[PDB]
Design a protein around this ligand. Structure first.
Ligand SMILES: Nc1ncnc2c1ncn2[C@@H]1O[C@H](COP(=O)(O)OP(=O)(O)OP(=O)(O)O)[C@@H](O)[C@H]1O
Ligand SMILES: Nc1ncnc2c1ncn2[C@@H]1O[C@H](COP(=O)(O)OP(=O)(O)OP(=O)(O)O)[C@@H](O)[C@H]1O
Ligand SMILES: [Mg+2]
Ligand SMILES: [Mg+2]
Lengths: 691, 69, 570, 37, 97, 50
């Protein structure tokens, strides 16, 4: 790729350290080069403002240099040091050669008309309501437009009852047919325009809030996938599923009748001025009921929040239970736990329905309170308006207009009362999204990137335990592995070799001591980079619901298919794939349903070896296999370990007999090291006992 | 159309099954000691809301009778 | 058929309280007729001559009836929600029972998030039913008592309203199908999103074992963009619906205003009657706006009921209930077994004809992908053979009760997954009231007591995931103890020694004599060491039983595939 | 209105394009003042 | 304390057919037993005596002779806040009448 | 600043291998490699922190 090299050169010019392969890993997911938007994402992630703008041939003398030009149909180059009155341009071609001065005619022949401008501006808040504040600021033009539209909507709704007052005050009394027709047609036009304006307002607001929600969802998933393994270990899958679907709750709230209603409510002072103009001693009741509305709302809000928190706790428990039951339906059906399972489901469901009913009864109590506050003010308005129209200074049409103005004031209030449940649901949902987002991640230092790995693994003074109160798993693991060294690890079931596998790759951090890869400490190394450089076949061995070729090429989807053929041949599963009808395109299904144990074992082996890893770990990649398929991997090990530091963990000792070193581990202590015959020679050794 | 006919047929067909689909009566301290669900399903609303609604009913009825007669 | 009629009987079950809501509901409208009528009195007997005491009487009699409306509407919706949550609980219990009664082939052909979304559509139905939906349509249906009063005021404006209503109905029917289709598309996208999220969080260990975060991020971004775009199309259609309802309401209101003003200046009508008509029109169209604001919820409920029907109409395999078959021994007979996972899929087992006698510790050895797990899944009622049949204790399995056999049969599968419970409960999942000493004996017999005793919590530690929180061999031993904790008559150990070291395998082999005290055990294992002491070895390749007999007599032939595997082990 | 959701609406809601476009303009920015007067 | 709702209520001989089982009966003057699986139209009751023996079916006359008229009903409802002013809030709710 | 930048204060765009050769030549690579952060640790003051 060239564009990536251009990005590296630009970063070096602006004096920031980058790794081209790391950018390729994080922004070339589909392969086949970076592209434009991937390049801009990488540059923005490097704290480097960039913009793809179209520029004329003469305007290139006023831009700041350097500037990479993006050619749609071919290769790119970087212009720098523009020369005036010479028709010559100093461009570095991304083909590895000298920076060349190109003449005017060829440049105008080799320039599409667009360019990328680059500048650097070098001068973790908790996820709360405040996170939406920049979202308000970023989409400021749309929200200002919506505010203007809402103000004009209120103006139309204000001009609606002036015609009513005219009709009941000046057309009903004397006579009138032409003025009646004029009022009718003008009112029809203004209500049509009001309806169109309101529809456009809510459409635009829904679009903008939809964009906001999409950004929030992308950020949430990006932060979720960077969370540590112990995070997922302490919780359950259904809990996180419910937490993510709380974002669906937020969105289902947000693009509705929610913020438009409160925008209409906050723009009710335009109505208030006109009602005050009609009569002074008829608006004090509304101006006093508004604090009564606020008092009722602040009284009902915390109890409803506590009910909805309980309801969401029940919903999350039910979600976790349901997902756990469905994802393990094989063992659930295999035995007769189903009566008990349905019993606990009935318990949880009854609790959830009770919580929901207890929510909705309080919701309707709150609604009836708002209705009561509206109705008492309505009846006292009737009383005072009757006094003011039987005495003077107020006419019958003025009273009618005042009553309908009060109704149009209180209709947003009753809409707020109706969706108060969803307001409190968002109030707890943003809190839960923060609870997911505020947890510490597997962050790495944003310093200079690290080079490629040679297989120099050093465990020094390692003391690791899974939980703070858990018993010590690894006591004093000190060990050194060099490049091209086929290490094998053996021990009793539960000794702690899988902990060594999970400590090579940064799944956890040791409590005492440290592990260094190629002399670089992992305590601050980038986990993503090492997970890219290391291919691991795990013990759990689950697959993902896609085609077999895509499942194997999940790490590098942008490569060829002949590499997949080579990897499957080394794994001994190319033929078992070929005699399938769809070949590599067959759907393996969820949790590797479509394939058996050994087949998906070979698939995972091929998937972790198809890349070019410097460290290659096989954590019991053999235990699910059989003979005449074991021997294929044993014969292919001379090609598998060609330059790669291979670590094999297996309870079948025949897979470890040809290892350069064999490490016996017991209770997380390394007791024996050496070759196979160096350990089997002594009959008192643990290797001989296991033999 | 035909869906109204089939709904009427099903409604009558389950209309002949009343007193066979109904469940036996139980008081409050007896029916709250049921499995969590069965209790959730066979608890009547209460004696308070029914009497309150019927009191509002009677108030309106006597008001209308007094106003007319 | 669970199309929509399942609510028809149950609503009948609470017919009494429902008739009670109707007796309330119509009179609510009568209260909603009391307040506007008083208005015209104030505008026909107080504003014309004079008045201060009659206005006092009107205000006093109006405040109480308004408060009674408010409290009666609150109690009405309280009663409706309480009596509808019971239907909700019934539907939920039925749904979960049918879900757990579904066959394995139902689950394997689809994802987990799909079924999760289907069950959450019940939560959508819950939010619909105990809401502001059925009360609004009940008010709209019983608002017709206003129309007679309308006919008391003026025939022309009443005809205007009576023609406004068909406009509402026809335009709602016009706009319903497109909103339904877009909500169906949105639901399908949401189901795909839940499927991806579940398969990504469940397999987070494998996702983070490799470095493939960005590809999952891109897939999630595309799926989220699609789902939110479909939801936005649903939202703009709901906007169109609400705005059209507003247009009809406002146009009919303008016509009413003009015609009423013309009538009043033409006689036979008064200003009080006109404002009373306007109040009645507003209060009778308020349910229409009320239902139009949740038309999208109505269509979502239609989709949800359709999808619950799609789940519930799948053929279940709960029980047959035929003559109460008595307890079984290890009498298993295969006859002409032909089976395919899919109708288009190639045949796995061709001519499997096996007979297993009681107490016979039988082992099966074959190549990877030969189909040794198919026999395991066919002993139990996971699948139905395409041709031929299996029989247990002389009884055919095409009509036997699956739950009865699968509680009579103890099995450890090729892949072992536990629940997020304690070890004492995970092992004793079959019966929670069974004593601790039985579990202790099972764990000692399975060789699992030593590490559990060495564990910090003992029998109190929690398996934090499907099988995580412990090791692989420990999980296998716990699964073995769970299978052996009861008194099953048929035991199936499919790869019961996979993640275990040689010492634990030797412990299990020494305890195997205590395992098989009168139980027929089928051992599916690639390791030939654990089947050396098996009572009968059966070799299968490409779904064909190709060698069968004792271990020594089969190993005596150097040309046998078993012997071939024997020198491949060495 | 009866047409389904396709690529022309799929692309504009992809979050990367949202991240590039700072201070975004809506599809109908001028229709407000156009529909007012 | 075991999270198991119980209530000591007086119950008539005929109302025992509608309670959920099991139910321990508390005898004031002597030993207790636990009724379970009430039988209709048979005048027989399956009671486990707390004396260590088999669950026995007792006939109507002896049961009405050996029943004081009270029973304990049992149900299970299985679906640390700081001590502040809020702790008095349930105390307000519990004594609401 | 960091050691990689403190040594390369004259030119920040100059490659890492030049600094590695300079540190090996100056005998400073051994302790820096033995340092926890390597070339990432920060001199906390004018000369303190080391
Ligand atoms: N996710 C975890 N959470 C908590 N404790 C764990 C976890 N994984 C392992 N342990 C603890 O660490 C011990 C080491 O288990 P580990 O998986 O490393 O064993 P192993 O030797 O690889 O097993 P086997 O070879 O039988 O698969 C376990 O016995 C358990 O006590
Ligand atoms: N869920 C499935 N859907 C479709 N085909 C399947 C499924 N599971 C297995 N198969 C096919 O059937 C074959 C045999 O399946 P089975 O699970 O019985 O294998 P096995 O002999 O137990 O495997 P192994 O020895 O590798 O554990 C597989 O090789 C595969 O081709
Ligand atoms: Mg392990
Ligand atoms: Mg298998």
């Amino acid at each position: 790729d060239y564009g990536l090299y251009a990005l590296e050169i630009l970063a070096q010019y602006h004096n920031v350290s980058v790794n081209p392969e790391e950018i390729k890993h994080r922004f070339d997911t589909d392969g086949t080069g970076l592209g434009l938007t991937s390049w801009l994402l990488a540059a923005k992630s490097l704290e480097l403002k960039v913009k793809q703008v179209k520029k004329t041939i003469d305007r290139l003398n006023f831009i700041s240099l350097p500037a990479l030009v993006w050619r749609e149909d071919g290769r790119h180059f970087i212009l720098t040091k523009v020369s005036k009155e010479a028709n010559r341009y100093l461009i570095f071609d991304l083909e590895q050669r000298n920076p060349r001065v190109l003449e005017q005619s060829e440049f105008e022949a080799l320039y599409q008309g667009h360019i990328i401008l680059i500048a650097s501006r070098s001068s973790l808040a908790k996820f709360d309501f405040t996170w939406f504040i920049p979202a308000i600021i970023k989409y400021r033009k749309i929200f200002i437009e919506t505010l203007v539209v809402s103000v004009f909507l209120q103006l139309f709704a204000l001009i609606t009852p002036l015609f009513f007052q005219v009709v009941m005050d000046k057309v009903l009394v004397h006579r009138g047919f032409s003025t009646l027709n004029v009022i009718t047609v003008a009112l029809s036009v203004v209500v049509v325009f009001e309806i169109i304006l309101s529809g456009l307002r809510t459409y635009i607001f829904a679009h903008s809030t939809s964009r906001i929600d999409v950004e929030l969802g992308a950020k949430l998933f990006r932060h979720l996938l960077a969370l540590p393994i112990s995070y997922f270990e302490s919780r359950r899958v259904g809990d996180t599923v419910a937490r993510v679907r709380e974002l669906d709750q937020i969105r289902n709230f947000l693009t509705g009748q929610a913020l438009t209603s409160v925008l209409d409510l906050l723009f009710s002072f335009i109505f208030f001025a006109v009602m005050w103009y009609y009569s002074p001693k008829l608006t004090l009741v509304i101006l006093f009921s508004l604090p009564c509305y606020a008092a009722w709302s602040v009284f009902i809000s915390p109890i409803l929040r506590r009910r909805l928190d309980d309801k969401f706790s029940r919903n999350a428990d039910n979600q976790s239970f349901l997902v756990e039951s469905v994802t393990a339906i094989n063992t659930i059906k295999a035995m007769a736990v189903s009566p008990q399972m349905t019993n606990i489901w009935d318990k949880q469901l009854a609790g959830y329905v009770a919580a929901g009913f207890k929510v909705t009864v309080l919701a309707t109590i709150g609604q009836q309170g708002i209705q009561l506050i509206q109705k008492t003010v309505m009846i006292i308005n009737l009383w005072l308006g009757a006094h003011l129209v039987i005495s003077g200074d107020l006419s019958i049409g003025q009273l009618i207009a005042f009553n309908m103005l009060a109704g149009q004031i209180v209709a947003p209030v009753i809409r707020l009362a109706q969706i108060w449940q969803d307001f409190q649901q968002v109030g707890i949902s943003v809190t839960r999204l923060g609870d997911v987002l505020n947890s510490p991640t597997e962050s790495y230092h944003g310093k200079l990137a690290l080079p490629e790995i040679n297989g120099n693994i050093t465990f020094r003074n390692i003391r690791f335990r899974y939980k703070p109160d858990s018993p010590v798993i690894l006591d004093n693991i000190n060990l050194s592995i060099k490049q091209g060294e086929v290490i094998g690890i053996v021990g009793r079931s539960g000794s702690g070799k899988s902990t060594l596998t999970k400590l090579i790759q940064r799944f956890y951090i040791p409590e005492n001591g440290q592990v260094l890869i190629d002399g670089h400490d992992l305590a601050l190394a980038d986990p993503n980079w090492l997970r890219r450089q290391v291919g691991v076949v795990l013990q759990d061995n689950v697959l993902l619901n896609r085609s077999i070729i895509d499942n194997i090429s999940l790490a590098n989807p942008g490569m060829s298919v002949e590499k997949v053929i080579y990897a499957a041949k080394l794994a001994g599963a190319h033929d078992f794939i070929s005699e399938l009808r769809e070949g590599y395109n067959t759907i393996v299904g969820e949790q590797g349903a479509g394939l058996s144990g050994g087949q998906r074992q070979r698939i995972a082996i091929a998937r972790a070896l198809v890349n070019n890893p410097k460290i290659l770990i096989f954590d019991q990649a053999t235990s699910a296999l059989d003979y005449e398929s074991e021997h294929i991997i044993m014969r292919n090990m001379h090609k598998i370990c060609k330059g790669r530091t291979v670590i094999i963990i297996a309870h079948r000792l025949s897979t470890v007999k040809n290892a350069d070193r064999i490490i016996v581990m017991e209770k997380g202590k390394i007791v024996e090291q050496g070759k196979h015959k160096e350990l089997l020679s002594e009959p008192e050794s643990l290797y001989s006992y296991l033999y | 159309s035909e869906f109204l006919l089939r709904y009427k047929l099903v409604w009558s067909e389950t209309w002949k099954i009343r007193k066979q689909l109904d469940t036996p009566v139980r008081e409050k301290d007896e029916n709250e000691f049921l499995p969590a669900h069965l209790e959730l399903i066979e608890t009547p609303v209460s004696r308070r809301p029914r009497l309150v609604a019927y009191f509002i009913m009677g108030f309106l009825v006597i008001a209308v009778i007094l106003s007319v007669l």
